[PDB]
Amino acid sequence: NEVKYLYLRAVGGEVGASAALAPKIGPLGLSPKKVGEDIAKATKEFKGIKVTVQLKIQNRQAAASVVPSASSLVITALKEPPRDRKKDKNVKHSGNIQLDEIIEIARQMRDKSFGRTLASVTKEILGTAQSVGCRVDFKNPHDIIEGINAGEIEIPEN
């Protein structure tokens, strides 16, 4: 009755490769197939994204719980078409996300982030969205960060 937590990163929206799933799961004796479709069912809407999945392994069953990351939540803010790895090589994520969406994913990320305020956590999310390349209301995430820093963009603390 030893609950073990296994952090694995598989491609969302697809069944994970059995060779990649083998070394961390095989000594624990679970079926690589079954943990594959469990991770796929947990990550249906994360299609084309390397997403961290925590496997709660306890008594020969593994529960696949998605650990939400900033890049994954920003791409599932973009709602871009699913990533085809083979053909295009330098996809610049040029979709537009809005401030209410960055507020709502900050509210989702409130349980793990170490920022004091929602403004600071949204600044972190804007930095991650800048690392991805996303434009926020047709404006630069940088410029929006200094807007909130100067206080021109008031963020509701609820």
Partner: protein
């Protein structure tokens, strides 16, 4: 123990002598000998603690009752303590006799401790105590000693180890003796009794019980006993034993199953995971003495279970072995015993494959030497997969052009009017280069086709760059203006089309499966990074740290890949070389600085042809 001084010992025999002086039995003795074992000599009390209530460390029981006799006898007789030799002798109940009293030093150690601990009692006692008998061994081992239906009657006979059941043997190796070539069949009688003159079915590895391939219902001349080097005939031999026999030699190749029942299948014809990887080109120094080389190659293939003799595509005799050790020993045996002729060893010269990747820039024109007929064509590369299909036989040159065109167009994406109008394939009547007709205004499309096919066969068996075969070239005949006149025209026309379609060379590419540990993957990745190794992928099983890499590797670096890889990684890695496919190269044959130019120039200096790479200028017919 040690075989050099001829001795062995076990705590089981030390228990056999310690039982009477301590009152405790064998198993519990050795339980207080291995592990956390300690004994207290101040109160005579065995305990699981290195120290006591007072706390000075004690020493282990394995060190006080066993290694302490060994240590003190070493110290006394190496440092010449004759005041300590006889008292230790009588304490350890050794007895000396005569000269063995008179010995001193290393030979004294030899004799007194050969009298103390012979190797026989120990090594013999383990191999009979714990090491398995054939009944239990086959009772859990019956399903890999037979590849097929595991519920068969012969298999339950194997699992029960019946001496008078259906006779099956497995000739495992074709063992060499001093019979001037004629060997003996070293094999194990798992079931049945082999007799001198018994009609037994010789089954080859390719044999299946529903066919006739490599199956010989033949009698045995003689059955012989094996004791390492001598030869001794035996009448009969029962199940579970390994015996030699002669008479199977002229019918069986290398290894083979030997059954008496038609229902019984073959067994596992080895697994190796070693494979013949390193390859050398053998030829003669005497063409008159070449028959002895061919007989010697056949005999060497019979002799060593992992040697492989086969012909190349360029004609040399490729001998394939596992390593440089194994090749050099097989070659010395072949040169001195199997053939008896001085040979020559060479690198395995590779057949390369000339291939264009472009459409021809300008129209390919050639004319008859009598100047009556002209030919206009183009040359274009063919897709890799569809050429593989042609070479695999989906696209077979003997079918009806209609249904071929249907498959070619619907699955592979071609122009179907052409695909019905397909003319021919080369080389060898089955190759992937094909000639296609586009001409619509030519009246006589019947008196040219046979000459077209014939000298396309000639061009594709001898292309224009360095006189070697072609691949994945489609020849669009666009126009002809109308065998002594047509054959040179299409020779020059295919030549001009190739050289105007910008040729390159395909080099062969191996797929290698390397079994390796996760602490030697770094060395293997370093070796593949030395030599252009595009590893396809990365597999393993989870229970073991053994880890397989499937990889693409070229041949000009595979010449010496095996030694370099094992030098860098130790003997940790094991390769499985099988030929994958043909891959393209990215250099121009006309440029001698590049790889393609170097390899074509090396081929021209090897074959003694003209030095330059000929082109569309002198393979063109202008006004």
């Amino acid at each position: 123990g040690s075989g050099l001084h001829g001795w062995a010992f076990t705590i089981r025999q030390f228990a056999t002598r310690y039982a009477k002086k301590f009152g405790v039995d064998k198993a519990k003795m050795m339980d207080r000998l291995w592990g956390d074992s300690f004994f207290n000599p101040k109160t005579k009390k065995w305990t699981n603690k290195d120290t006591d209530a007072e706390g000075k460390p004690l020493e282990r029981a394995f060190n006080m009752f066993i290694l302490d006799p060994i240590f003190r006898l070493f110290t006394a007789i190496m440092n010449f303590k004759k005041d300590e030799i006889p008292v230790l002798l009588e304490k350890l109940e050794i007895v000396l006799k005569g000269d063995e009293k008179d010995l001193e030093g290393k030979a004294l150690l030899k004799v007194v401790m050969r009298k103390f601990l012979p190797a026989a009692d120990a090594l013999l006692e383990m191999i009979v105590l714990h090491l398995p008998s054939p009944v239990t061994a086959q009772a859990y081992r019956a399903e890999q000693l037979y590849e097929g239906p595991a519920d068969d009657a012969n298999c339950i006979a194997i699992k029960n180890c019946d001496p008078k059941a259906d006779l099956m043997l497995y000739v495992s190796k074709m063992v060499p003796t001093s019979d001037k070539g004629r060997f003996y069949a070293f094999g194990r009688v798992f079931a049945g009794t082999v007799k001198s003159g018994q009609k037994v079915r010789i089954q080859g590895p390719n044999y299946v019980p529903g066919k006739k391939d490599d199956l010989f219902i033949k009698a045995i001349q003689r059955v012989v006993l094996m004791m390492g080097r001598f030869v001794e005939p035996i009448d009969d031999c029962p199940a579970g034993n390994i015996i030699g026999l002669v008479g199977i030699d002229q019918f069986l190749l290398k290894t083979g199953t030997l059954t008496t029942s038609e229902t019984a299948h073959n067994m596992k014809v080895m697994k190796f995971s070693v494979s013949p990887v390193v390859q050398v080109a053998v030829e003669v120094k005497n063409a008159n003495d070449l028959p002895k080389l061919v007989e010697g190659l056949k005999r060497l293939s019979k002799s060593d279970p992992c040697v492989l003799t086969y012909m190349s595509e360029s004609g040399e005799h490729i001998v394939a072995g596992t390593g440089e050790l194994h090749l050099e020993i097989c070659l010395q045996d072949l040169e001195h015993d199997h053939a008896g002729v001085p040979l020559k060893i060479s690198p395995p010269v590779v057949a390369y494959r000339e291939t264009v990747e472009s459409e021809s820039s300008q129209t390919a024109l050639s004319k008859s030497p009598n100047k009556h007929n002209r030919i206009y064509l183009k040359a274009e590369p063919i897709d890799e997969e569809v050429s593989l299909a042609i070479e695999n036989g989906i696209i077979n040159p003997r079918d009806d052009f209609k249904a071929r065109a249907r498959i070619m167009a619907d699955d592979y994406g071609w122009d179907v009017t052409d695909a019905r109008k397909i003319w021919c394939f080369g080389p060898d009547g089955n190759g992937p280069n094909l000639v296609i007709d586009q001409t619509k205004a030519v009246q006589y499309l019947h008196e040219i086709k046979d000459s077209v096919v014939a000298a396309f066969q000639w061009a594709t068996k001898e292309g224009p760059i360095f006189g070697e075969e072609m691949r994945s070239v489609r020849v669009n005949i666009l126009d002809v203006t109308l065998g002594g006149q047509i054959i040179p025209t299409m020779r020059r026309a295919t030549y001009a089309g190739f050289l105007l379609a910008d040729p390159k060379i395909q080099e062969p590419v191996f797929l290698v499966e390397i079994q390796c540990p996760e602490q030697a993957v770094g060395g293997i990745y370093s070796v593949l990074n030395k030599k252009r190794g595009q590893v396809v992928s990365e597999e393993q099983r989870p229970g073991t740290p053994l880890f397989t890499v499937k990889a693409y590797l070229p041949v000009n670096e595979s010449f010496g890949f095996t030694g370099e890889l094992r030098q860098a990684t130790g003997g940790q890695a094991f390769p499985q070389m099988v030929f994958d496919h043909w891959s393209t190269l990215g250099s121009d044959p006309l440029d001698p600085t590049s790889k393609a130019g170097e390899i074509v120039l090396a081929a021209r200096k090897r074959h003694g042809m003209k030095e330059e790479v000929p082109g569309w200028q002198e393979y063109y017919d202008k006004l």
